A paper describes a structure:
The FPC is a macromolecular cytoskeletal structure and is essential for the formation of the FP and cytokinesis. Here, we report by yeast two-hybrid, bioinformatics, functional and structural studies the characterization of a new FPC component and BILBO1 partner protein, BILBO2 (Tb927.6.3240). Further, we demonstrate that BILBO1 and BILBO2 share a homologous NTD and that both domains interact with FPC4. We show that BILBO2 interacts with the BILBO1 EF-hand domains via its C-terminal domain and with FPC4 via its N-terminal domain. Together with BILBO1, BILBO2 is the second bona fide FPC protein and is involved in a tripartite interaction with BILBO1 and FPC4.
Author numbering:
A (entry chain B): 432 to 438
B (entry chain A): 4 to 110
Write the structure that this text describes.
């Protein structure tokens, strides 16, 4: 569902 | 009870843990200390020798569909999803999975 964020 | 999920990168794969708190809830610093303990034990379980540490944290905002910097306890609502960045880590975006229970890792 959620994709991990990028900094 | 308030359920907060906390995810992070482990050798390229995303690992997600669920923590259950009283109706009042956690403070950010407490959530970060629990997460650090749990993921260090997880790394040890998987055979990873390096330590886990947080150098940045974000929380997913449902209303705007964005990741916000995690700075205040008022950001920790029920069913929140937190993501912890680490130092010395290549963090490539990938799907965050269903969580394991985080409490067995608290020791
Ligand atoms: Na939220
Ligand atoms: Na980083």
């Amino acid at each position: 569902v959620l994709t991990s964020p990028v900094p | 009870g308030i359920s907060i999920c906390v995810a992070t990168d482990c050798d390229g794969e995303k690992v997600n843990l669920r923590f259950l708190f009283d109706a009042a809830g956690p403070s950010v610093s407490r959530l970060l200390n629990y997460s650090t303990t749990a993921f260090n034990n997880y790394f040890r379980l998987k055979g990873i020798s390096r330590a886990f540490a947080v150098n940045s944290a974000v929380v997913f905002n449902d209303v705007h569909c964005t990741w916000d910097r995690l700075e205040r306890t008022t950001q920790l609502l029920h069913n929140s999803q937190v993501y912890l960045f680490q130092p010395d880590t290549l963090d490539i975006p990938a799907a965050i999975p269903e969580p394991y229970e985080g409490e067995p890792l608290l020791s």
